[PDB]
Prior knowledge:
heteropentamer; B: 225 residues; alpha/beta; Rossmann fold; C: 272 residues; mainly alpha; Rhopdopsin 7-helix transmembrane proteins; 9 helices; 82% helix; globular; binds 2-(hydroxymethyl)phenyl beta-D-glucopyranoside; host-virus interaction (chain B); transport (chain B); magnesium ion binding (chain B)
Amino acid sequence: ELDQLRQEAEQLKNQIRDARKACADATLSQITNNIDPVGRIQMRTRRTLRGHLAKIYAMHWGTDSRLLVSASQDGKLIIWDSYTTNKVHAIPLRSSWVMTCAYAPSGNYVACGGLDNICSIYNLKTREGNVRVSRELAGHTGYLSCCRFLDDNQIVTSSGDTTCALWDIETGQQTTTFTGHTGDVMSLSLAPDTRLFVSGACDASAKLWDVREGMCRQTFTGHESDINAICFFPNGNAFATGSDDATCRLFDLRADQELMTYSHDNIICGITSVSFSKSGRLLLAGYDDFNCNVWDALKADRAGVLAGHDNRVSCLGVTDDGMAVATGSWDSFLKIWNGSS
Amino acid sequence: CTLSAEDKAAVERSKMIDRNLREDGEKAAREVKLLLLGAGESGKSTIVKQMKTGIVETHFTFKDLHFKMFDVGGQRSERKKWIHCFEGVTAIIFCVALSDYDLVLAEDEEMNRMHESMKLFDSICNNKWFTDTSIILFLNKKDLFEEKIKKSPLTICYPEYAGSNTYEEAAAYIQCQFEDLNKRKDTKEIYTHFTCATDTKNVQFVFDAVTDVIIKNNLKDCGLF
Amino acid sequence: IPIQLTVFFMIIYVLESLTIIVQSSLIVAVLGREWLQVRRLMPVDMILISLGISRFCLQWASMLNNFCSYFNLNYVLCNLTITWEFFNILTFWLNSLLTVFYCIKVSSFTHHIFLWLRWRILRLFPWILLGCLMITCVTIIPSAIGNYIQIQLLTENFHQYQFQAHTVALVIPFILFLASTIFLMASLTKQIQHHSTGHCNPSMKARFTALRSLAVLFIVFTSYFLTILITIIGTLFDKRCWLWVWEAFVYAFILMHSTSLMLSSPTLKRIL
Amino acid sequence: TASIAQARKLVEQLKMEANIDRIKVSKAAADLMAYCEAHAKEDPLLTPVPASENPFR
Amino acid sequence: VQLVESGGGLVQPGGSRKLSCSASGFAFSSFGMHWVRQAPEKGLEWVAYISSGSGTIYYADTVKGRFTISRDDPKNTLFLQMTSLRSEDTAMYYCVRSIYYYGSSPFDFWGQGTTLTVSSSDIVMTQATSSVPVTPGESVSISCRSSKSLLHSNGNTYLYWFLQRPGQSPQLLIYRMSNLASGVPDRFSGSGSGTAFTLTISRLEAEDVGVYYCMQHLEYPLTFGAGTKLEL
Ligand SMILES: OCc1ccccc1O[C@@H]1O[C@H](CO)[C@@H](O)[C@H](O)[C@H]1O
């Protein structure tokens, strides 16, 4: 019966390809060929942070745009006060292999995950004055790539088992599981409304998932190699993807096909992290050329290069109020950049 | 000045945290790290117990050095996408089963186990990250091969092989065949050693290899290289 | 004495001086940039930068001294000998510290007291640098008092005491430097003599390269010390009759020494 | 019959993704650029900020 | 979390006394310790201060010289040594914890205290309300007054509120003039700017009986107000 099933699947693929052909009318450049260019963008390091002794892999801003959390391979989770460069907490870890970290919106819990295939939850505000483990979620078969909190009692995770999962923390049991990826997924960015969330995998495919019904809704393709990073537009109707080749892409949601690509001749290496500014005009990316780049989203032209790291830029983040940009590389350093007037 | 009392207290807290981090790094610096790889057929679960989840960690102390052995073979994912986390290790221990040339893989029966080990070694030796990391080769199941080579020649997997069917000639031929796969024979040193029942001697071999690599690293640090 | 030889060694010494000056400038620039950017440097770079600034001072001191002493035009404070002695003793102590660092870092001993001491030395290297400078000053003060007394007499005996002070001042670092170099060479030779089993590709060449570099350094520094001392006596050698040839000799020695130390830097080769 | 099973699920999935409302991308680009222009006023990394106000300066 | 102390009683003049604070139920090395004396029928006055790691040691002017304060972190104990006592040192003492970092709440816990009876510039806080009779269900406001401005360029105002019931230890209600602690109900509120400082209670329970106190923590001489007495 495989023959007929394959033939009808191919027919449906042709049907959707024709539908996408009907959808596409004009490219983004034909519309954004008249707006004013953003001009030169120059930023410098207002403050620098030190204390790690190994490569930094993850970094997440708090909800108040003041407190920071960083994770590195020496087995430490450090919470920084970026205003005056003090350390408020230094949590030791049980496993030294981590690749993600998060900050709960309220500001009471933090989360960690790595090669150990378990998600650890830490509680900050207690009566006795030390951080403690609150939950150790387990059940995934494969390394965890990213974790993001939902409501201080729910969490969503993505792993190398080609699977995403949704958990509640009290009982510590899975509620819904998302499957449909051939290669392993390595990035997810939750929507502001916490109703839908998108994920990009290593098979050059991105997908949309509903958080309650737990089924795939839209499937996006257009890349060749693996997809390494993803981020959500502040509006909630678009998202950007970073690729293992020297390309980035922007997708809209009500139209399944892509809008614009970001590439250049001199750049050959891939993209590690991607983040958006709050106004949605600037697109920040980290590369393997030991520097970060800024793209004008509506025009796909370079407008700024942040140099100053001696190794690969691993993590990149933007505050909620959009006042500073945080960057972390493999040289055991963290940096906070902000332009001057 | 222009700072409050609570600012002073926070500054002292930060200084204490920095001191603790420095001491932790000082303690963690003097430790050797070994990464264990190889085909999952055999030879990996035996050397791990000769010394005495997705990742497994083992600690053992020998002649006043601390050894951390990392075994990751149950991860079952894309090796490229996480093999870079192990850059900076002292050495890679590769275990190769020897009495499997006659043996045939369950999948792709026309394709032999020995060729799978060969391609694994060719992929791991010439990787971009491990350009200076030494590789310690462990050829396993000597007795099984001795009782097996007496019946079948290497032509079942090595048709071009020539020479006598005795044990020593075949063992030397296989060792040379595996050592020939190295391309950058200026920085790497491949140490080969056939295993036996006694576990004390294997630890001595890994100790000597680690000592040589660490002395080379110290010479590189001082610029005398 | 033909004038052609005099001018030939004139230009030789001038080119040697400019070469050593530019080498010192390059190393100080790169190492200062690295130290400022990273906020932490390995000790060998600290010793290299200390030696570089010492050479920077000594070269200009020597140049002004030779000009003033030979041309004999407008005899002024240009007769600067105290700075020369101070900086020479500084370089001697710095080289001894570098050699003892080489000895301690490579050494395979992991004794708990020894390990703690080595970690302390790695912790407070600038403190040891300051200590070396302090010993240098404490040692040079007697030369200053002897010069003051001799000048007061001017405006044998005291001069002989100053000669003895110079000898005692310069003979301190050399014993430690020689002992450390000999120990390092002996350890590497023993490892060579019974380490042939552990293959030959990256280890035999490394040990032989280290031995060759140490031998070159030993020979060059012994030659420099011998010429400086033979100058110190000065009864047999008439510096008045022949000066520029001797200058070219000694500063060719210092040129080879500085070139070797520049080429052996780990941070620079990484940058290069 | 595992291959037949996964093929059946794939066909059903393509069927559900088939019936989705779509609309041309000109309006999508217009909406995205309108939102970008909507908050272009109070953008700190885009527009200059006084030094006294700046948290980090 | 508990804090029990020992030592004291009747002492002849000219003697010496060892006072001990023994802590159990929480981490200790991350906390700084304070001592506070209580006048026989008046408000409390600050005495000493030790910080975490035994780095900074602070005293009061009236007790300098003959007072010493130390700690033993591994055994979790705190010591005060007093010499050359006099009739002034007739008070019942309290042992207080405080932790300092971004967002922390200082003066969260208080102890029971022990009695010491013996035989025969600084910023000033004034509360001139003395005593006021109120009935349950009637909203109440309490005022505290300072001399110098209590606002620092870091955007923080250092005023603390305390409430003391008859037969109990003080409890913290408001820190940094505007924030509630843990265990406090919602009905308590606080506000004010500059010098005049206001505390408001909307609903009154039977348990809301006693004396209210305002405290400053800007300059290290820590002075208490006269206090507000509330009764039915
Ligand atoms: O002659 C006096 C003297 C005392 C102590 C140390 C060096 C000295 O003389 C040195 O002789 C060198 C000979 O090449 C010259 O190059 C130096 O400029 C000179 O200072």
